């Protein structure tokens, strides 16, 4: 059921996560918080040139195993 993905930051860190394709963007950001300390509300995730909406799922954005997402922070 689970799936490994990568979150590449703008700080030269690559994060790796286990997620399910039914997980929401909001869930992924929550995982990012747990692991990195980043408040979800400062988080913007990007996949395939698109900014990802909190309420949809990884599946909705056809995010697959070993996909890379990009984390951009607004502070």
């Amino acid at each position: 059921a689970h799936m490994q993905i990568f979150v590449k930051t703008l700080t030269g860190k690559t994060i790796t996560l286990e997620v399910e394709p039914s997980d929401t963007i909001e869930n992924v950001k929550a995982k990012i918080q747990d692991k990195e300390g980043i408040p979800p509300d400062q988080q913007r995730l990007i996949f395939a040139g698109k900014q990802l909406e909190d309420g949809r799922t990884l599946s909705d954005y056809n995010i697959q195993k070993e996909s890379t997402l990009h984390l951009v922070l607004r502070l």
């Binding site: 700080t11 030269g12 690559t14 790796t16 900014q51 502070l75």
Partner: protein, 250 residues
């Protein structure tokens, strides 16, 4: 003579309308994720703090209000939280080529949270930067349509550079010494500025004093401070009176 509600400029000016974005421009977050802008070999430790916004070069740049007018940045709009957006081509922070090639085209970047002058290390160029909520950018060349606007601002910027660099360097020097320095400073190769004179300083005295004060305040760890040197006391006195009174004392 109708003015823009946002930027305050006269609307009956066809030149004012910002044209098309750079080709295939993307939004700011997508732009910032482009590999060409990465200076890192990414590892599981990171190189920078998350508290630190990435910093890039920006060339062929244009600044505009939300109603699409090309806009100067030195008239207090940003400070009043008027939203000024920009577009251009982001380039790696080390890149010194102002060409579009190798850049990442961005549109509707910002709005600009603050702008600033830096680069007071004695090199030839002044550096002008923008901060947004996502990144900082160091400007390179303006777009052709924005060049006239950006050009108008250059004199006050390089007088300020001269003054900051002179004062940080020479903690017990006089107004007379500063004027001598200003008079003997050659304007930058890339521009077409006139020689700088004492009256150059006097005309921009208030802006120059603000840049000194901002330089000092930004120094959290006063490495080359200025504060109230004697020359600076004279500049503060000048900046607090009208231009005519400054000139009377010359």
């Amino acid at each position: 003579m109708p003015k823009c509600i946002q930027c305050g400029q006269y609307l009956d000016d066809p030149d004012l309308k910002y044209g098309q974005h750079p080709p295939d421009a993307v939004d700011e977050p997508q732009m910032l994720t482009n590999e060409k802008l990465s200076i890192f070999d990414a590892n599981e430790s990171g190189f920078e703090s998350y508290e630190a916004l990435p910093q890039h070069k920006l060339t062929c740049f244009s600044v505009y209000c939300k109603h699409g007018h090309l806009c100067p940045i030195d008239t207090g709009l940003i400070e009043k939280n008027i939203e000024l957006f920009f577009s251009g081509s982001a380039k790696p922070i080390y890149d010194d080529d102002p060409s579009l090639e190798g850049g990442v085209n961005g549109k509707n970047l910002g709005p600009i949270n603050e702008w600033w002058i830096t680069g007071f290390d004695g090199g030839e160029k002044a550096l002008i930067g923008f901060s947004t909520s996502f990144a900082e950018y160091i400007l390179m060349d303006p777009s052709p349509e924005y060049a006239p606007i950006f050009g108008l601002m250059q004199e006050k910027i390089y007088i300020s550079k001269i003054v900051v660099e002179f004062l940080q360097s020479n903690s017990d020097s006089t107004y007379e010494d500063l004027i001598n320095k200003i008079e003997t400073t050659v304007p930058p190769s890339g521009l077409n500025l006139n020689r700088f004179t004492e009256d150059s300083l006097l005309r921009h005295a208030q802006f120059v004093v603000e840049q000194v004060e901002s330089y000092d305040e930004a120094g959290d760890s006063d490495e080359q401070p200025i504060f109230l040197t004697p020359c600076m006391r004279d500049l503060i006195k000048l900046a607090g009176v009208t231009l005519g009174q400054r000139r009377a004392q010359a």
